[PDB]
Design a protein around this nucleic acid. Structure first.
Ligand SMILES: O=C1c2cccc3cccc(c23)C(=O)N1C[C@@H]1CO1
Ligand SMILES: O=C1c2cccc3cccc(c23)C(=O)N1C[C@@H]1CO1
Ligand SMILES: [Mn+2]
Lengths: 82, 95, 96, 106, 96, 87, 106, 95
DNA sequence: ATCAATATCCACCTGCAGATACTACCAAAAGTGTATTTGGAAACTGCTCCATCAAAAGGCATGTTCAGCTGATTCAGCTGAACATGCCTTTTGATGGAGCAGTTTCCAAATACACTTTTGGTAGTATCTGCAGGTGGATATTGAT
DNA sequence: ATCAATATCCACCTGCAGATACTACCAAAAGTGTATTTGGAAACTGCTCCATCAAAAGGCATGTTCAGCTGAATCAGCTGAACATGCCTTTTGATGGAGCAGTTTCCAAATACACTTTTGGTAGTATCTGCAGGTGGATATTGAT
């Protein structure tokens, strides 16, 4: 039963996210839009994190790489160092 | 092996000064650590900027204060200023 | 032979999830997606367990907020059902 | 011989703050009282969040502060919320809030 | 006596002002507003003329942006008339 | 110097035509009657914040004159960077 | 006597750029490649924006680039628009753009 | 009566290269001047942080490069990377 | 209303993951004492440019009039919520081995610096030129009918 | 479609102020040339923590059923756009006087050691406990009737 990885981000999960957001009713087309948005977010954040990796000549993305990426995307995260 | 410095203990000292019967988890402690580093950088960042704008070689308490004023919301700013003037006074007046 | 009315559980779910703080997407599917998207930037890349974790925390925090403004945008249009245009409008006003 | 933190009457490390400034390329020179003031401000701000988070620990029948308690503390205070309005506290969740029009007809 | 149907001049004016780059608030009135607000923060202040002009340039650029965003909010509501709720949604999503 | 005349209510020189023109540039076709005050309010908060910061740079420099640079620096701080004035 | 600008085949002042890096306190030491490379990037970007600004001036029967022309360039170019997406060009106005539903008849 | 340095003559040179009969108003030049200073600050900014995050105390051409990729989008980055690499080679080869 | 299906709440039990406790113990900041360097407040004053002032030139306030937009009302139909039914993927745990990060090397490229050269900014005085804003006069858009 | 009022076009037209010119000057850059210091790449490697694979756990995919939301169509009430009119406030061009900004002084304050003392991080190792995730029975919420 082959499957795309973005589809692995499932409806029930997206439904739960919306719930935390206080969403009560969800049009059927949200789940594809949401995956759309999430992929764009992850691309933007990862591209930068890896750029940080490569600079440091590593084969491994460190949490700090991600933390630094999040900082310059203006999405500062607390909890993982720095 | 190499040391990992952290504001953790000074956070813990402060915790007990305000809530002696209150504890803190690792993840909570970690966030406090982020918080202290962040605010550090923001305040230092602005102070750095001020100094250059005025073509000065030195980050003084004057710069840190203006920096605090620029970054902190009204009430928070106000206290930080008072807390920060106090510490410098207490320091000068002392051998 | 008894059945809850549409929206009752949604409300019930809302209160449950606003109360807790666990990540609401399964770790593995997420790990895959991250790993996959990264492959397009550099190959043979390993990921710190905590680095993936950072990304999920950030992503979910991001998504949860986007749903809030989204929901505001649905309600602006006198609906109660969020829709892609609501997401589209939020992201546009956010400058994304 | 006493530490500068004790001379300032502070818990935060006046020494370290000074060191981290120099090795931060923020300016050429760095005056004797600027690590003092800075460390003061950091302590105070730490105290506030810990204070408030502590309260939220109480409110929730708990003695040990966890991320959630930092989130509720910060997001329930107009000012700490503005200061951190572009920050995410990992494992913090969100404030319970439901848009009123979403409530059923009572 | 000829008459343009409402909306026609409105569009004429949109085309007009989208074409130019002149400022739209009269200089002096704006200058006084600056001086009034400044004075409340601090007495005995002077302004380089180009300080006033800098503030005006930013103030109009901000307001025009906000109206773009506002307009999109109205239309999202299936209206063509902006109203305060439209402004307030824009500013909410912007995180103001 | 002798008597600096009292400044008050200068928000009201942000005339209805001036607020309509900006809307036009923003591509707004139709305007509710309540917009003008809302916009006056919104303008005022905008200015307060940019002037507070500017005046904070002025005083730090020990000056009596708010400079374009003070304003350009203030605008940068709020993520509203301005080109054209030494900025 | 030869300039490092000529040495790198650049119009932009390598010497000047070397100096400004020192005085802006970005790091303890500054390698000799750095300003050469930065003056390059800086020159390439101003070239791109002038190319596009020049076209706008031409598209408008003008011969002198004015701020409007810069705004047309940046705003009409996906990438330049993002680079400067939180920047205001004094006296540049906006892109003519009226939303669909606002237009008359059908 | 101190000298206010700019990038005006360099901008003007480059201008003459790409549009030989087009001029530039001084307000336009001003913006151009603001633009250069901005980008300089942001590349140098990213460069600074980068060095720090790697306990590197030198900003080399390699640092600047990573700043450029981190800052600029897609094609502007890709092209800027060439043009800078090119000048560094040429500068090396010329001594 | 009542009646019951189910969610939710509170008190209490408890095992152990996570947090506190210690202390060897030790490298590496942090403080102290003295020799040396430089930054910037102060005291002076040259000189831009800001406030402050009178003329004309141009756009704001206001009332009338009604086109058409908003929002209320109604309703019919598609569309998402709820919830059974089984079932295939995530989660958790256990273990070599990849690579990150610790350490010493040593050399190319850095900072320091002293004399020498060129450049860019201005400042004084220069005539050159794109286009703003005026003109009329030829054509498009619009809205009544 | 037809007409006619009004906007829009745009092409030709002097006025000028902003741009381009240049000449003379120079202070501060920038380049050049050893003299001396070192940051980090390079190469070798110990040991985390990462990918991987397997046992157990557990939540998502699908389909039926229909409540109730969305949006289409209808509508009048009335708000906001157009525009005539009356006219006051902004624009813009000219002339002393405040403050900034350019000196140069020089001592209080910072750097730069170097040497003496300590604390804050690990990590061994052991010790202790807040609360998470059960339990059960009591009451509250929802929804059918
Ligand atoms: O003729 C007047 C006038 C006369 C009397 C009072 C006034 C008040 C404000 C504005 C104006 C005005 C005004 O723009 N014009 C137009 C003029 C051709 O340029
Ligand atoms: O028994 C199954 C099961 C059996 C067969 C296939 C499956 C596929 C996905 C999820 C499940 C599943 C599942 O949660 N459970 C719950 C069990 C009581 O702990
Ligand atoms: Mn006042």
């Amino acid at each position: 039963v082959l499957r795309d990885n973005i589809q692995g981000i499932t409806k029930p999960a997206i439904r739960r996210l919306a719930r935390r957001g206080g969403v009560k009713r969800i049009s059927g087309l949200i789940y594809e839009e949401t995956r759309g948005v999430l992929k764009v977010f992850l691309e933007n954040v990862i591209r930068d994190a890896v750029t940080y990796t490569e600079h440091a000549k590593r084969k491994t993305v460190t949490a700090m790489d991600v933390v630094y990426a999040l900082k310059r995307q203006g999405r500062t995260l607390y909890g993982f160092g720095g | 092996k190499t040391r990992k410095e952290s504001y953790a203990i000074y956070v813990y000292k402060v915790l007990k000064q305000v809530h002696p019967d209150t504890g803190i988890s690792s993840k909570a402690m970690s966030i406090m650590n982020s918080f202290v580093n962040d605010v550090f950088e923001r305040i230092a960042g602005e102070a750095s900027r001020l100094a250059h704008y005025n073509k000065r070689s030195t980050i003084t308490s004057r710069e840190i204060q203006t920096a605090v004023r620029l970054l902190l919301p009204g009430e928070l700013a106000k206290h930080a200023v008072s807390e920060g003037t106090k510490a410098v006074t207490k320091y000068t007046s002392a051998k | 032979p008894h059945r809850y009315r549409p929206g009752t559980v949604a409300l019930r779910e809302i209160r449950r999830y606003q109360k807790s703080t666990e990540l609401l997407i399964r770790k593995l599917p997420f790990q895959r997606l991250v790993r996959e998207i990264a492959q397009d930037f550099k190959t043979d890349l390993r990921f710190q367990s905590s680095a993936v974790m950072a990304l999920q925390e950030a992503s979910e925090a991001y998504l949860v907020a986007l749903f809030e403004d989204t929901n505001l945008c649905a309600i602006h249009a006198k609906r109660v059902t969020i829709m892609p245009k609501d997401i589209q409008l939020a992201r546009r006003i956010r400058g994304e | 011989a006493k530490t500068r933190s004790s001379r300032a009457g502070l818990q935060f490390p006046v020494g370290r703050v000074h060191r981290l400034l120099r090795k931060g390329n923020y300016a050429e020179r760095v005056g004797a009282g600027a690590p003092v003031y800075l460390a003061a401000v950091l302590e105070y701000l730490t105290a506030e969040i810990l204070e408030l988070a502590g309260n939220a620990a109480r409110d929730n029948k708990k003695t040990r502060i966890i991320p959630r308690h930092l989130q509720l503390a910060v997001r329930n205070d107009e000012e700490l919320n503005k200061l951190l309005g572009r920050v995410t506290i990992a494992q913090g969740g969100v404030l319970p809030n439901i848009q009123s029009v979403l409530l059923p007809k009572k």
